[PDB]
mmCIF file with all atom_site columns, C-alpha atoms and ligand atoms in Angstrom:
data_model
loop_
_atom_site.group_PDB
_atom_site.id
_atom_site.type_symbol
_atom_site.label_atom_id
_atom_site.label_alt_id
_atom_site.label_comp_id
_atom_site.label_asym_id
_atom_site.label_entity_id
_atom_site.label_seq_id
_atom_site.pdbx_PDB_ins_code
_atom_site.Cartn_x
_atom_site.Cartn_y
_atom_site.Cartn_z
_atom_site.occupancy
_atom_site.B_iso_or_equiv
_atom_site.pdbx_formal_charge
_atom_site.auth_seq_id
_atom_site.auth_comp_id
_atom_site.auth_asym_id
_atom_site.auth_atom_id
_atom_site.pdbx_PDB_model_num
ATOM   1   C  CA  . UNK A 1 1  ? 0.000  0.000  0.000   1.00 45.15 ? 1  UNK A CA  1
ATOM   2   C  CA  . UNK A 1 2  ? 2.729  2.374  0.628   1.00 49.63 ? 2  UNK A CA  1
ATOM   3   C  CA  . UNK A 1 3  ? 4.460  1.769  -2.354  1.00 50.31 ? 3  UNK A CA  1
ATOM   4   C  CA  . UNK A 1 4  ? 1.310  1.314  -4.456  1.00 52.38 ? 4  UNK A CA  1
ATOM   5   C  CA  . UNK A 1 5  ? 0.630  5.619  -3.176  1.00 52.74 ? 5  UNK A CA  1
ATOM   6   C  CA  . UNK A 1 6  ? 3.680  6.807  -4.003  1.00 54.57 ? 6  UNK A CA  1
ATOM   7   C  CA  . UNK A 1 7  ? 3.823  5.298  -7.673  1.00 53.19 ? 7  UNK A CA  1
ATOM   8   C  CA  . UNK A 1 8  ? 0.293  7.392  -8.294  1.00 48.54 ? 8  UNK A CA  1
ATOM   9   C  CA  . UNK A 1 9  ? 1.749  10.435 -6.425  1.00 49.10 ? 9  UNK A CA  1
ATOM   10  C  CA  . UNK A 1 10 ? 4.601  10.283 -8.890  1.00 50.03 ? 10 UNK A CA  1
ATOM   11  C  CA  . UNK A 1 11 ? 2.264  9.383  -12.006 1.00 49.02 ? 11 UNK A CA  1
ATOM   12  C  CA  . UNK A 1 12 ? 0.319  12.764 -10.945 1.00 46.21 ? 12 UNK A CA  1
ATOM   13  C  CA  . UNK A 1 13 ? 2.719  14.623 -11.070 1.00 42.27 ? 13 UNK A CA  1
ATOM   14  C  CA  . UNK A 1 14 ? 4.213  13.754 -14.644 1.00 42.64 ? 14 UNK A CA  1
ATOM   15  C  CA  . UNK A 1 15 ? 0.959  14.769 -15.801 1.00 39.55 ? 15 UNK A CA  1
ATOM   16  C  CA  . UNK A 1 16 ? 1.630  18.355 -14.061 1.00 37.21 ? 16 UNK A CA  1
ATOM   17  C  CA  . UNK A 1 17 ? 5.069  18.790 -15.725 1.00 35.05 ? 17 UNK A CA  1
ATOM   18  C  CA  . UNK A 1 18 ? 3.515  18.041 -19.140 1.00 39.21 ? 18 UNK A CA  1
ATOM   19  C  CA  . UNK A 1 19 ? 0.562  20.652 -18.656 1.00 40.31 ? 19 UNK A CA  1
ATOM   20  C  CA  . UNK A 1 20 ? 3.349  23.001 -17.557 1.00 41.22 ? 20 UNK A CA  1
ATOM   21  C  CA  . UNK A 1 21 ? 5.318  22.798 -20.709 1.00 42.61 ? 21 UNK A CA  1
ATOM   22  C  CA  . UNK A 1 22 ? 2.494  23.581 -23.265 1.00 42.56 ? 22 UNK A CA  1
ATOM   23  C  CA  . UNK A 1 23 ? 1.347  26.552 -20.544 1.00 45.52 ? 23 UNK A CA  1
ATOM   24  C  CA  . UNK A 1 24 ? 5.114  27.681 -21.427 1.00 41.77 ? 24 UNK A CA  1
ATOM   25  C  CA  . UNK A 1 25 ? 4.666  27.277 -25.036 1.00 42.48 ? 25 UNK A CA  1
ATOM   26  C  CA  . UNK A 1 26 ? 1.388  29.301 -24.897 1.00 41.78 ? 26 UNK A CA  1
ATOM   27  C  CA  . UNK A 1 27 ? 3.543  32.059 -23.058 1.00 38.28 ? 27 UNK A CA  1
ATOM   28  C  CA  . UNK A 1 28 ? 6.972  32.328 -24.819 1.00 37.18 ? 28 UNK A CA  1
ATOM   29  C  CA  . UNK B 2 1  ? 13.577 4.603  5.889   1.00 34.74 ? 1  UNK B CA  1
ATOM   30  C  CA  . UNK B 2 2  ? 13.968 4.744  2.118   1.00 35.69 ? 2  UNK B CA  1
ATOM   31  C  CA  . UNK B 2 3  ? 10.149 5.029  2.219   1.00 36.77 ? 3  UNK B CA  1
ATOM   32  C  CA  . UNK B 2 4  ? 10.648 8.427  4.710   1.00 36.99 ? 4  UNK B CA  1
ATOM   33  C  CA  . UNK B 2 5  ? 13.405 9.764  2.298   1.00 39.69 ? 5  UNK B CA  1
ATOM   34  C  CA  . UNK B 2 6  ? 11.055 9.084  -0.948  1.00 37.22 ? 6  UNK B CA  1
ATOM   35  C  CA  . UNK B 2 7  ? 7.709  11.395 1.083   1.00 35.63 ? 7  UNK B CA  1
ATOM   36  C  CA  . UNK B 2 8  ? 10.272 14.299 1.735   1.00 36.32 ? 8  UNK B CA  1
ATOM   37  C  CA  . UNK B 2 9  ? 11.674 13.831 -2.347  1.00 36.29 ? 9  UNK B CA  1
ATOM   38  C  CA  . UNK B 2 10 ? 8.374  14.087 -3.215  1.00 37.07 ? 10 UNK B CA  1
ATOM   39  C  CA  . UNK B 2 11 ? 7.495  16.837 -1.091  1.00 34.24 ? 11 UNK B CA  1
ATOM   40  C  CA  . UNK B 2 12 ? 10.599 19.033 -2.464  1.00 33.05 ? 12 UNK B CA  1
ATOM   41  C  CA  . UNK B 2 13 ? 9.475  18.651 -5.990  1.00 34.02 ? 13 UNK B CA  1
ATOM   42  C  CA  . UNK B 2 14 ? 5.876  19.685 -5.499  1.00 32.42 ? 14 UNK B CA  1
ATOM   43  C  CA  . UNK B 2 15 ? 7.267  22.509 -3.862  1.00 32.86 ? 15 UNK B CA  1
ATOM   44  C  CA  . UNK B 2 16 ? 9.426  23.487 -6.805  1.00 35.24 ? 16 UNK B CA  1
ATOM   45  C  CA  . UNK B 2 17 ? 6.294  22.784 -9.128  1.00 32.92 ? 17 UNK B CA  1
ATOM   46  C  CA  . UNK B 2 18 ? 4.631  25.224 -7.244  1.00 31.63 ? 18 UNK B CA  1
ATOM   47  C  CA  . UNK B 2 19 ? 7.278  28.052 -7.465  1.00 28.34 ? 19 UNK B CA  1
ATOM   48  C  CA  . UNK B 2 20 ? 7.306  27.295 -11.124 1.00 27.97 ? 20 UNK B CA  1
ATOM   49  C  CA  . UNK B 2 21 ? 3.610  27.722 -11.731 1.00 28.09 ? 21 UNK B CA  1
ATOM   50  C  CA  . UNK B 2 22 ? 3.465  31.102 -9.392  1.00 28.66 ? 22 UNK B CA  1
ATOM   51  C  CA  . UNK B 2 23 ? 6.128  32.212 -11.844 1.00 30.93 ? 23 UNK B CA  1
ATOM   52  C  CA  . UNK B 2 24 ? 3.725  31.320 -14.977 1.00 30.19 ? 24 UNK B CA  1
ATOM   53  C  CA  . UNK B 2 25 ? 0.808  32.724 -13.823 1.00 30.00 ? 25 UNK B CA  1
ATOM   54  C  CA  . UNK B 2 26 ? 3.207  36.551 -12.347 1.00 32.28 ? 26 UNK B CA  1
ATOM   55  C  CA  . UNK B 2 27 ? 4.260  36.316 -16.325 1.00 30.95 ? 27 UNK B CA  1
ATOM   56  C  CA  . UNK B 2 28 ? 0.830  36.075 -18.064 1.00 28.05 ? 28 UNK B CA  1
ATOM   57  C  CA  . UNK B 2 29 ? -0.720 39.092 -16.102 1.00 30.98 ? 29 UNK B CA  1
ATOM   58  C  CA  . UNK B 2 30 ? 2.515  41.405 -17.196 1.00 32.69 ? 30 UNK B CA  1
ATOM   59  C  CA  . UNK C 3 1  ? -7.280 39.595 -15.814 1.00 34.23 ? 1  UNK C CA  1
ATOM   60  C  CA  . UNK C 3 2  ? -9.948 36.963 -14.876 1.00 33.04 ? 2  UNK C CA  1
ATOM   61  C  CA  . UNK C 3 3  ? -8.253 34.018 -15.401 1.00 32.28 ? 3  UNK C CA  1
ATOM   62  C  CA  . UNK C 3 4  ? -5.107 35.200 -14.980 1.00 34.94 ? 4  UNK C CA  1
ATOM   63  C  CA  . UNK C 3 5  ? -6.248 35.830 -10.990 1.00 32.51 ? 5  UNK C CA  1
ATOM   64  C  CA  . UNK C 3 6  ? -7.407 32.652 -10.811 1.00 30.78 ? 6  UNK C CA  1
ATOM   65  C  CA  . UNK C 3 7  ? -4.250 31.427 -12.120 1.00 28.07 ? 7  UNK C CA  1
ATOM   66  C  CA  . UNK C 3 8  ? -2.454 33.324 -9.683  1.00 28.06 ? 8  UNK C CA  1
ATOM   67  C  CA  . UNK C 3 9  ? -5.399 31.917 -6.381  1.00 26.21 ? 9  UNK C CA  1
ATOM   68  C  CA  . UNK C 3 10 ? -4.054 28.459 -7.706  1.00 22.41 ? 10 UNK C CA  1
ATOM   69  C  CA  . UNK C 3 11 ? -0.566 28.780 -7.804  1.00 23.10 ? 11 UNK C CA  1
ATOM   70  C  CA  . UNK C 3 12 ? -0.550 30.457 -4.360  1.00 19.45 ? 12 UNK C CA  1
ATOM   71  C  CA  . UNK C 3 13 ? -2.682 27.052 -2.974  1.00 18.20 ? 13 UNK C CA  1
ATOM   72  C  CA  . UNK C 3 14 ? -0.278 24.502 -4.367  1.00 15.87 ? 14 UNK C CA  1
ATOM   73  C  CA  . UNK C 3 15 ? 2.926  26.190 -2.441  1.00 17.21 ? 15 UNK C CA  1
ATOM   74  C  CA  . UNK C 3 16 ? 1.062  26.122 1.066   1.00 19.84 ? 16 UNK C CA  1
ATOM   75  C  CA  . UNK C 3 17 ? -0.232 22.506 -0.032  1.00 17.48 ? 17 UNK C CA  1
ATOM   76  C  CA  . UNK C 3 18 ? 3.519  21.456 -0.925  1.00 20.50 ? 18 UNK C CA  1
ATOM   77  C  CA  . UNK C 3 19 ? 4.438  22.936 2.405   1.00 20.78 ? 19 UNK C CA  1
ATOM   78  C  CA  . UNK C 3 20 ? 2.079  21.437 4.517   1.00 23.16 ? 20 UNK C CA  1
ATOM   79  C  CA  . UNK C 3 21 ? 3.493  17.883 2.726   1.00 22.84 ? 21 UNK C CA  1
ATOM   80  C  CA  . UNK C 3 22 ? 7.440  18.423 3.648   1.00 22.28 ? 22 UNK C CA  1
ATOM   81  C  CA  . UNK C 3 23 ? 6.306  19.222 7.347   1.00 18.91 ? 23 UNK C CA  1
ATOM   82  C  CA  . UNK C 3 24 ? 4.176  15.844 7.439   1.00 19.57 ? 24 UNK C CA  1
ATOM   83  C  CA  . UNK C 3 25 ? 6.720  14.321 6.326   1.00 20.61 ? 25 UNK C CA  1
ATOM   84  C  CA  . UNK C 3 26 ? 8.771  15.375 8.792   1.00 20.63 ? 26 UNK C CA  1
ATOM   85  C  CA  . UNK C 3 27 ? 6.586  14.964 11.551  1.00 20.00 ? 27 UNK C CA  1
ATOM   86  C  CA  . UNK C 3 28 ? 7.000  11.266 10.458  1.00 21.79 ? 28 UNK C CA  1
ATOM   87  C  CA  . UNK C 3 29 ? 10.338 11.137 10.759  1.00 16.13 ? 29 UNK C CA  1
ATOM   88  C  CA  . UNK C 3 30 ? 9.683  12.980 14.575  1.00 19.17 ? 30 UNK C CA  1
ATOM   89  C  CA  . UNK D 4 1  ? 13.100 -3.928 -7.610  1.00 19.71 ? 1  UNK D CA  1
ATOM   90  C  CA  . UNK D 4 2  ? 10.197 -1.404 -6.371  1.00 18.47 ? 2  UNK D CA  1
ATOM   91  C  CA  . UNK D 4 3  ? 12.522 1.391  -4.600  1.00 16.07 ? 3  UNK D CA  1
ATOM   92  C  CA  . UNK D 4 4  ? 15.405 1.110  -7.512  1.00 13.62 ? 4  UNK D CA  1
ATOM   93  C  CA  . UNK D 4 5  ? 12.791 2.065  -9.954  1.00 15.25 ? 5  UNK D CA  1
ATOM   94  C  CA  . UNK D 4 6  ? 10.640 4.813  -8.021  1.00 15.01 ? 6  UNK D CA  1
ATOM   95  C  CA  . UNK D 4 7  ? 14.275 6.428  -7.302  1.00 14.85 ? 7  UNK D CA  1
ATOM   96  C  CA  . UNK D 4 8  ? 14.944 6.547  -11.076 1.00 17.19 ? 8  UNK D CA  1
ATOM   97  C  CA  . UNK D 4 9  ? 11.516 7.486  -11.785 1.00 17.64 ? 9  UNK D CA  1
ATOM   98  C  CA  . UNK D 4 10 ? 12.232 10.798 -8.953  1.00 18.13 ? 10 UNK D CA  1
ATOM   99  C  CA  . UNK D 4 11 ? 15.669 11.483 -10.502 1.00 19.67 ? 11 UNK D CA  1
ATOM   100 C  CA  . UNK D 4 12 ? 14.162 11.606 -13.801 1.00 18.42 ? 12 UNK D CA  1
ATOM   101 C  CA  . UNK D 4 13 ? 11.249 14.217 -12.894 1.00 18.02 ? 13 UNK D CA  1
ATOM   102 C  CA  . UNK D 4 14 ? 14.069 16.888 -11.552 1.00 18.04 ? 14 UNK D CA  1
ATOM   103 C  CA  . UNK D 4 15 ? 15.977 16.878 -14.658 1.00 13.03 ? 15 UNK D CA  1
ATOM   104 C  CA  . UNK D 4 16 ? 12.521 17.052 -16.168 1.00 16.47 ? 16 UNK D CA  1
ATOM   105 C  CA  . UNK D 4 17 ? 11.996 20.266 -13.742 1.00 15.50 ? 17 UNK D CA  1
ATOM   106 C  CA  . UNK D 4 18 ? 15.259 21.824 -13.858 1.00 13.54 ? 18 UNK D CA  1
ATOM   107 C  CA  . UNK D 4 19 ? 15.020 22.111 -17.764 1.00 11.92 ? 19 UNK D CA  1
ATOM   108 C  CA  . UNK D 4 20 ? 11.774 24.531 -17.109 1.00 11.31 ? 20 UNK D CA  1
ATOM   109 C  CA  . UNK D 4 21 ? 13.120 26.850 -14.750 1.00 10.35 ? 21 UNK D CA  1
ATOM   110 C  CA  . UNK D 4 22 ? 15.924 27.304 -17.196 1.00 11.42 ? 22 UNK D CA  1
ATOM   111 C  CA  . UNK D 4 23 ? 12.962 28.101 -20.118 1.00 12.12 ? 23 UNK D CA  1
ATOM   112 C  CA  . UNK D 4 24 ? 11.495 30.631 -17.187 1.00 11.15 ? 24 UNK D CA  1
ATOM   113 C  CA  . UNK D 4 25 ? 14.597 32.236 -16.468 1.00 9.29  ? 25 UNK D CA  1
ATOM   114 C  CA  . UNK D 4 26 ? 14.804 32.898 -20.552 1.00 9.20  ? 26 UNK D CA  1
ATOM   115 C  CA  . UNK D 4 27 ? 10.893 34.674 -20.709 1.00 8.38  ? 27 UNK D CA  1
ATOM   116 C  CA  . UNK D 4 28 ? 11.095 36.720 -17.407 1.00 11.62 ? 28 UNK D CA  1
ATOM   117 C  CA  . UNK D 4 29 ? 14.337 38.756 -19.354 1.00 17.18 ? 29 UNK D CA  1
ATOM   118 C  CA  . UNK D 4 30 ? 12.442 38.765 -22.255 1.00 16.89 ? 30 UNK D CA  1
HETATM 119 NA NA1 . NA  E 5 .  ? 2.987  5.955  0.993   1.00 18.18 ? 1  NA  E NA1 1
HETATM 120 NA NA1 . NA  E 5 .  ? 2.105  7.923  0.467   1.00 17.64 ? 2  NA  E NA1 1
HETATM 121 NA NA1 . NA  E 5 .  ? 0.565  21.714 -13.684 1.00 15.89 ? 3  NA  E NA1 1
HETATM 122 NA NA1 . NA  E 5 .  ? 9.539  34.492 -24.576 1.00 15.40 ? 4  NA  E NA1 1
HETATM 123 NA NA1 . NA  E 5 .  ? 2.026  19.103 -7.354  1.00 12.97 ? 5  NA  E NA1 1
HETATM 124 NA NA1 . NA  E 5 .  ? 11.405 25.704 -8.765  1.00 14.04 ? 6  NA  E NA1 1
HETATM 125 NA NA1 . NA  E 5 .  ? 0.249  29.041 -13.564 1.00 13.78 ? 7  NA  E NA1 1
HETATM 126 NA NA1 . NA  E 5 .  ? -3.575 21.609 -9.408  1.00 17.45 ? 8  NA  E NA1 1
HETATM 127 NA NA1 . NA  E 5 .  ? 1.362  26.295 4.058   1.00 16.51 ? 9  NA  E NA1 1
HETATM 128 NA NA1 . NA  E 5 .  ? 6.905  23.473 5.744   1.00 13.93 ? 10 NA  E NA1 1
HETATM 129 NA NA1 . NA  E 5 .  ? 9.861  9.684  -14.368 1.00 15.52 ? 11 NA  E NA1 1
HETATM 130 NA NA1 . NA  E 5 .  ? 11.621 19.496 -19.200 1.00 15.04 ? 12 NA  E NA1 1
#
């Protein structure tokens, strides 16, 4: 169970770095 | 633990997530 | 200047949230 | 096994991250 969290805390938070790159991209 | 090390890893990169997206949003209202 | 205060509300949340996560963390380690 | 590759998985993400602020640094000069 521990382990099992922290894989989906880490999946989550791919998904933020991606939306953060095309927010860039709007920006630049 | 390497469990208690990973939380706190974790922790300092939502952090730095954060700081990036204040940064994003300062830029966009100019 | 709608969405970019909005933008800015969000951005603000996420650093207390990220915060709040290093100093559980910590607690744990306590 | 399951720590090796959730440590790899971490180290990845802050190169990931570091490349950004680097991008940021770029459009707050410009
Ligand atoms: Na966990
Ligand atoms: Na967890
Ligand atoms: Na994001
Ligand atoms: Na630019
Ligand atoms: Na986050
Ligand atoms: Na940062
Ligand atoms: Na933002
Ligand atoms: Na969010
Ligand atoms: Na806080
Ligand atoms: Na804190
Ligand atoms: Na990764
Ligand atoms: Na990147």
């Amino acid at each position: 169970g521990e382990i099992a969290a922290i894989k989906q805390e880490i999946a989550a938070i791919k998904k933020e770095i991606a939306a953060i790159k095309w927010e860039i991209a709007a920006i630049k």
